[PDB]
Structure 1
C-alpha cells in the first residue's frame, strides 16, 4: 500500500505552475547568497539536483554555509517537545532571498532619516491622524435600505 520514500506524496508539491514551466532563469544564477542571510527554501522541480526534502519546502531559514554550487540553511523543526535546528544542503537554485525583514529594515532606515532631519532643522512629515475619531458627516446622497419583493423572486432559478 502506501510507502514512505524520499519524494512520497509530492505530486502537487514538486510541480510547476500552469504555463510557468522551465529551468531557472539568469537572475537566479546571478543572485548572491552570503552567510547569515535569510532565505526561503522553495524547491524547483525542474532542477532534480540538491532538492530539499518535502518538509523544508516553504520554510525560511538562515544561511550558515556557502559552497560553489550549494547553500547551507539552518531550519527550525519541531520534534516532540522541542525544536531542532536542522542544517540542510541544497543547490543554489532551490533558495530565494527572503524579504521577511523588509518591513523591519525599512523601519530602521526611516528612524535614521527622521533622526537626521530632526538633528539639523528639517521639517518632519506630518503625523497621520486616526480614522476612528468622531466627526460630522455630510451625506451627498441618502438611500433607503430595505428588503423588496423583487429580492425574493430573483433568487428563484428556472
Structure 2
C-alpha cells in the first residue's frame, strides 16, 4: 500500500507544462465574479494554497462564495452511493468560468429572442434546414478500386 501527502504528487500532471510555466496573467485577475457561477477548476501551482487536492481539476461546480482573494466552490464528489457537495476554499487564481452552460442558455435566450421576434417582434427570418435526406444525382465520373500489386515493384517494403 502507498504513501500519502495531501498534496501527494504525480508524474506529469501537476508540473506546470509546455511553455505554460510561470504566474497567472493579469487577464486572469481582471476577470470579475458573481456567485453561483458554474466555473471549472484547474491548478496553477503558483501558490500552494487555495489549491484543492486531487479530485478537482477537470470538474465543474458552482461557486457559492467570493472572499478576498478567493472563491468558494461546492463540488459534488462521488462517494459510495452518492455525490457529496464539498465546499472548497480556493483563492481565485485556481478557478474559471466554463461555457458548459453558457451555450444552453445562450441559445435559449437567443432563440427565444428569435422565437419572440418571429411572432411578436417585427420580422420573420430563416435559419437552418432540416437534418439529412435523399436526392437526384447527375454524377459524371464514377470510379471503382483495384488495390495492391500492380506496379508493386515500384513500392511496398524491400
Q: What range is the shorter-chain TM-score in?
A: 0.7 to 0.9
TM-score by length of 1: 0.87
Query: Could you list the per-position Cα deviations for residues 134-153 of structure 1 after superposition, in whole angstroms to 9, with x for gaps in the alignment?
Result: 11122233212232414866
Distance apart, 1:54 and its partner CA: 1.2
- Give the aligned partner of residue 36 of structure 2: 36
**TM-score with structure 2 setting the length:** 0.87
Q: Quick one: distance in 1 between partners of 2:6 and 2:106? A: 40
In the aligned structure 2, how far is the partner of 1:150 from the partner of 1:7? 62
Distance 1:151 1:82, change over 3 A: farther
Aligned counterpart, 1:3 = 3
How many residues in Structure 1 have an aligned counterpart in Structure 2?
157
Question: Structure 1's 130 and 151: CA in aligned 2 closer, same or farther, altered over 3 A?
Answer: farther
Maintained 8 Å contact 2:117/2:124: no
**RMSD of aligned Cα (Å):** 2.2
Give, in whole Å, the separation in 2 of the partners of 1:7 and 1:155.
55
* 4+ residue segments displaced more than 6 Å: 151-155
| Structure 1 unmatched runs, 5+ | none
